């Protein structure tokens, strides 16, 4: 669909329950002052399988689980926690930094929102064009 991506992830500590207040911490977040720390709760929890949604209310720690109620806050990576000083993990070092560049234009009408939402879609789909 359009902009309803389910966020794949891995749970290490705590049992994730659908419909729970969640404090999302981004890479720029620090435990000292204000950052991109939002208190938006998670809508539900969906199990990952062969292209179909499996609703699950709760899931314990130590597993790998994707969640729904995200993708309009985060950009590339992040962590969702509830502790007041939950430190973020190390920054992932990508394989190859962008080198080759091209100029993208369009000869059609003012489809700027379509192109920007498309590039956002690629950006969220994989470590694609920044």
């Amino acid at each position: 669909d359009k902009g309803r991506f389910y966020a794949f992830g891995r749970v290490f500590a705590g049992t994730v329950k659908s419909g729970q207040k969640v404090r999302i911490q981004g890479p720029n977040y620090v435990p000292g002052k204000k950052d991109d720390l939002f208190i938006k709760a998670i809508q539900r929890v969906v199990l990952m399988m062969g292209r179909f949604v499996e609703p699950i209310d709760d899931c314990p720690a130590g597993n790998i689980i994707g969640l729904v109620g995200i993708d309009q806050f985060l950009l590339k990576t992040g962590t969702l926690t509830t502790s007041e000083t939950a430190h973020n993990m190390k920054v992932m070092k990508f394989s190859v930094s962008p080198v080759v560049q091209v100029a993208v234009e369009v000869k059609n009408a003012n489809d700027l929102p379509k192109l920007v939402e498309g590039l956002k879609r690629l950006s969220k789909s994989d470590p694609c064009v920044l």
Partner: protein
């Protein structure tokens, strides 16, 4: 006799001036002719989103001096060209190219406000957040 008909059965006759002479009022032909529906670029509504295409700047008119840091927005409904203006100082930094912005009127119901010429639409919401709370550091704009 004041120049107006005063017959006991002159209701229709007195009515036909009232139907045609009332066209002079601004409230009449601006409402039941469709000017807001077909001529105004807002569609006769209260709020409208849009997409920014460039960053512009207009100076001031008579005795005055100010670059108002206006913006150019294409509305998502009618697909027309409309020049907007942020009513807030220092909000040029937060807005950027390729931004979904919600705008509204100026309170004048369709004429330019002051020393800023041409613009009749004011930026209200930016990328799902508002500029008023943005200056107060209450909320932070999302990156995307």
């Amino acid at each position: 006799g004041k120049g107006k008909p005063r017959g006991l059965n002159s209701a229709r006759k007195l009515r036909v001036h009232r139907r045609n002479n009332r066209w002079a009022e601004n409230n009449y032909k601006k409402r039941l002719l469709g000017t807001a529906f077909k001529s105004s670029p807002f569609g006769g509504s209260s709020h409208a989103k849009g997409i920014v295409l460039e960053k512009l700047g207009i100076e001031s008119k008579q005795p005055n001096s100010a670059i108002r840091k206006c913006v150019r927005v294409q509305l998502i409904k009618n697909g027309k060209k409309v020049t907007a203006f942020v009513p807030n100082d220092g909000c040029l930094n937060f807005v950027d190219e390729n931004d979904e912005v919600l705008l509204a009127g100026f309170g004048r119901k369709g004429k330019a406000k002051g020393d800023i010429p041409g613009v009749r639409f004011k930026v209200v919401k930016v990328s799902g957040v508002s500029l008023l709370a943005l200056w107060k550091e209450k909320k932070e704009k999302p990156r995307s």
